[PDB]
Curated annotation (Swiss-Prot):
Record-given protein name: Stromal membrane-associated protein 1
Tissue specificity field: Detected in bone marrow, adrenal gland, trachea, lymph node, spinal cord, peripheral blood leukocytes, thyroid and stomach.
SUBUNIT field: Interacts with ARF6. Interacts with clathrin heavy chains via the clathrin box-like motif.
Location(s), subcellular: Cell membrane
Domain of life assignment: Eukaryota
Residues of the full protein shown: 9 to 136 of 467
UniProt gene name: SMAP1
Zinc finger (C4-type) in chain: 32-55
Role of this protein: GTPase activating protein that acts on ARF6. Plays a role in clathrin-dependent endocytosis. May play a role in erythropoiesis.
Length: 141
């Protein structure tokens, strides 16, 4: 029996640190966006998805230009990055990155693979669906 009666965001206004948690709570962000681990603490804002500690390490390798890894709380954040977390989040991330995946796709369990999978997945953008972002048009600001 889930009584509920929990959700007074109103009071928690202008509170990012919290918002971040609200997302993870969602089943969509309840597991890593790669290894689908249990309890994805760390999170990659540059991309807009929550990842575990193990994977996080790989992201760093990619480069501060490809993906920036940082702590969800232990580290500081900014509205600019916050909005992104939601704008993208794991939801879209799947409909984007996990869009060009094979019918019998299966997340890697061993690091030896994960490291690459994520790399060739994001770095190489192998399973990257560009069609989605087909609204590219830089105009006067
Ligand atoms: Zn992971």
């Amino acid at each position: 029996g889930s009584s509920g009666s929990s959700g007074k965001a109103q009071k928690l206004n202008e509170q990012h640190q919290l918002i971040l948690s609200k997302l993870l709570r969602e089943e969509d962000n309840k597991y890593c966006a790669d290894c689908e681990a249990k309890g994805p603490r760390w999170a990659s804002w540059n991309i807009g998805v929550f990842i575990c500690i193990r994977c996080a390490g790989i992201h760093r390798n990619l480069g501060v230009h490809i993906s920036r890894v940082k702590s969800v709380n232990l580290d500081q954040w900014t509205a600019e990055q916050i909005q992104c977390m939601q704008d993208m989040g794991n939801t879209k991330a799947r409909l984007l990155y996990e869009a060009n995946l094979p019918e019998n796709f299966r997340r890697p369990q061993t690091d030896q693979a994960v490291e690459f999978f994520i790399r060739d997945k994001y770095e190489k953008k192998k399973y990257y669906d560009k069609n989605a972002i087909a609204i590219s048009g830089p105009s006067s600001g």
